[PDB]
Design a protein around this ligand. Structure first.
Ligand SMILES: *C/C=C(C)/C=C/C=C(C)/C=C/C1=C(C)CCCC1(C)C
Ligand SMILES: [Mg+2]
Ligand SMILES: [Mg+2]
Length: 220
């Protein structure tokens, strides 16, 4: 009963991507061009992964490879967008990308490690530790940096950061409650539906807010 929700996610990502692409044309400043390329590439990768999952690919018997591939690809792009908005140094960005990659890779270790019970909980704990480190990172240095560019930049970055963090904090709960790498409290179809809603949020809503605020970010 999950094909319906996979196709819903597919169509939603497709609409988001087409909308972002139509918004992209006519861009002048190269920074806006970077914003448009990244913000359109994220939902396109998501749509490709969702179409793969919906058409008999994407899942291997016991494992879901398309979701984790999409995550490994797209989460660094969102981090890059946030850092560009805040103007963080390249070293901080490398740190953030490595920490996020470690988080997703730990999540994938739990989806594939299904021998006992404590081993997935340990993988979830360490990946959530990496998540908490990223949370600490986004609230501290990046916010002070964005405020150091200007106050409008600070407010815009705070809105983007609130959206990002609030939406990202729910993925590990879905993971720990689901059937894959979890305890089976919720079924597979509810897991996929909640992932679809979270992806709609984190990819289309964030991109809309970012691309709406480009005029005020330049004038500061
Ligand atoms: C566009 C895709 C997004 C925003 C999804 C990101 C995924 C996560 C933040 C998930 C993180 C996890 C943990 C914090 C620990 C348990 C395993 C994961 C991968 C579900
Ligand atoms: Mg996603
Ligand atoms: Mg998300």
């Amino acid at each position: 009963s999950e094909a319906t929700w996979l196709w819903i996610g597919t169509i939603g990502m497709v609409l988001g991507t087409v909308y972002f692409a139509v918004r992209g044309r006519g861009s002048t400043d190269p920074e806006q061009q970077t914003y448009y390329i990244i913000t359109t590439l994220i939902p396109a990768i998501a749509a490709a992964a969702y179409l793969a999952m919906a058409t008999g690919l994407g899942v291997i018997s016991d494992i879901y490879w398309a979701r984790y591939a999409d995550w490994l690809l797209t989460t660094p792009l969102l981090i890059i967008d946030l850092a560009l908005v805040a103007g963080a140094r390249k070293q901080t960005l490398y740190k953030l990308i490595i920490i996020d990659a470690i988080m997703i890779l730990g999540g994938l270790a739990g989806s594939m490690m299904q021998q006992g019970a404590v081993i997935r909980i340990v993988w979830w704990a360490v990946s959530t530790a990496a998540f908490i480190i990223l949370l600490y990172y986004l609230l501290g240095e990046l916010s002070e940096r964005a405020r150091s560019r200007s106050a409008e930049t600070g407010i815009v970055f705070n809105r983007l950061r609130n959206i990002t963090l609030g939406l990202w904090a729910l993925y590990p709960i879905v993971w720990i409650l689901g059937t894959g790498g979890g305890f089976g409290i919720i079924a597979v179809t509810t897991e996929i539906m909640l992932y679809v809603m979270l992806d709609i949020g984190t990819k289309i809503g964030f991109g809309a807010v970012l691309l709406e605020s480009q005029d005020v970010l330049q004038a500061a």
